[PDB]
Design a protein around this ligand. Structure first.
Ligand SMILES: CCCCCCCCCCCCCCCC(=O)OC[C@@H](O)COP(=O)(O)OCC[N+](C)(C)C
Length: 301
């Protein structure tokens, strides 16, 4: 069967909580786990020397002080930069504001003292290997990224790199996914034991034609709305459940990262949310007594 139909309700920190902390940094992950997130959610790219690093965009421009495409830079180049240079609470990463906007700019580079409990390295772009070292016992939702939407070779390069590494850990508490369905198929071929979730065309095909997503799928990981169509409804999740799949919902501009939304998606029987505000979600769950993995409680439907 599917263990993930019981792993609910999940607080899956979107890149660690991009509205509450520098996205894809160890600070964000360490913070997010500490306040009660059941699962990390993160993005992977690869350096010029084929090192899997945890970053979302193909270019380091938006979240750091540097410039260039991750695949053009070595890990040693990428690691020295400040992955909190442009963080602003409530607004992820936004360059060009008064330097006082940035409460954690410069901590990686040593110009400000880190908050208590963290080192300057907790604010750089981490190797995926270092995140796995740091969370041996936390499930990690990993998403394969590429150089551009149409650069199918870069997704496949990353899928290869990812499966090799995840195999070496011998772990199984992952969910690997990509917007590019080819990457998922290639990843599933190289690492059949690791749970996946469908890419874009598999989701369309399931929603539209009933076609079950690739063997090995544990969950459907869906935005709330897409191009006007409401995806994460009670009915859609009723059917996904009936067909044996979990539903994890993300937001990221398709619907507001706010309290009413999180509540509606909880009420829609989703099994996990991917909030940019993992603190805000954790408070809602605690306050409502919603069942959690292990810790039982209220079933909101
Ligand atoms: C008629 C057919 C209708 C059927 C529905 C079709 C819907 C299809 C839309 C695409 C859905 C693919 C889901 C699989 C990939 C995934 O998990 O999404 C990425 C998400 O976590 C973050 O979103 P971002 O773009 O990575 O942005 C954040 C960046 N950050 C973290 C720094 C803010």
């Amino acid at each position: 069967d599917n263990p993930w139909l019981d792993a609910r309700v999940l607080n899956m920190a979107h890149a660690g909580g991009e509205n509450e902390a520098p996205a894809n940094t160890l600070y964000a992950f360490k913070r997010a786990v500490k306040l009660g997130a059941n699962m990390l959610e993160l993005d992977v790219q690869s350096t010029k020397d084929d090192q899997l690093v945890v970053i979302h965009n193909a270019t380091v421009d938006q979240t750091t002080d540097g410039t260039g495409k991750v695949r053009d830079l070595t890990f040693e180049q990428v690691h020295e930069l400040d992955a909190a240079y442009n963080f602003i609470p409530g607004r992820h990463a936004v360059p060009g504001e008064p330097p006082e906007s940035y409460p954690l700019r410069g901590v990686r580079t040593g110009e400000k003292k880190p908050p208590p409990g963290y080192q300057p390295s907790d604010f750089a772009i981490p190797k995926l290997a270092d995140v796995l070292e740091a969370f041996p016992r936390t499930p990690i939702n990993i998403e394969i990224k590429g150089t551009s939407d149409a650069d199918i070779p870069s997704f496949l390069h990353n899928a290869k790199l990812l499966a090799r590494l995840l195999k070496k850990t011998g772990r199984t508490d992952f969910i690997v996914t990509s917007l590019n369905d080819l990457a998922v198929a290639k990843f599933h071929l190289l690492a059949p034991d690791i749970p996946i979730a469908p890419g874009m065309a598999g989701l369309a095909a399931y929603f539209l034609l009933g076609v079950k997503p690739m063997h090995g799928t544990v969950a459907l990981q869906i935005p709330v709305r897409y191009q006007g169509l409401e995806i994460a409804t009670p009915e859609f999740i009723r059917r996904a459940h009936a067909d044996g799949y979990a539903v994890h919902v993300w937001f990221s501009g398709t619907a507001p990262d706010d309290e009413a939304t999180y509540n509606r998606i909880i009420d829609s029987c989703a099994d996990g949310l991917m909030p940019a505000y993992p603190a805000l979600l954790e408070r809602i769950l605690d306050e409502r007594g919603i069942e959690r993995p292990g810790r039982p409680g209220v079933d909101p439907c």
